Design a binder for these strands. Structure first.
Lengths: 60, 69
RNA sequence: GGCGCGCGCC
RNA sequence: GGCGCGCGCC
């Protein structure tokens, strides 16, 4: 999973664990110096999308 | 909403409602795959996915696509 | 939500 | 023990 993978990355890198804001659906994810917001039809999807976005901005 | 669109088609056409059946269940507990068969009127299609819900949606979409054909 | 069956990282 | 994720059933 993107969330699981994001976590493992942080733990691996020695970064403080990812932080997700309370779902509002949009959820903002922050890890290291990254900040990405995800949207979706459910809170679960928003979180997943925020994670995927962060990993993507990480690869670039 | 494929499942819903297919049901409406059937009702509008005067067909008995679509019937969905689990044709196959496989894979390890954490990565299962399901296959569902969708039968309506004279059509029969199969759909697969990570969950029974998803497989059902796929089976319905395929049947509608076969219907337009 | 409960029950159950699993997996990843630490 | 902790964090996370997946599926079924109710």
């Amino acid at each position: 999973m993107p969330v699981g993978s994001l976590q493992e990355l942080a733990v691996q890198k020695g970064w403080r664990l990812p932080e997700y804001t309370v779902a509002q659906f949009t959820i903002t994810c922050r890890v290291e110096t990254f900040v990405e917001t995800g949207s979706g039809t459910s809170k679960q999807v928003a979180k997943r999308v925020a994670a995927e976005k962060l990993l993507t901005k990480f690869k670039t």
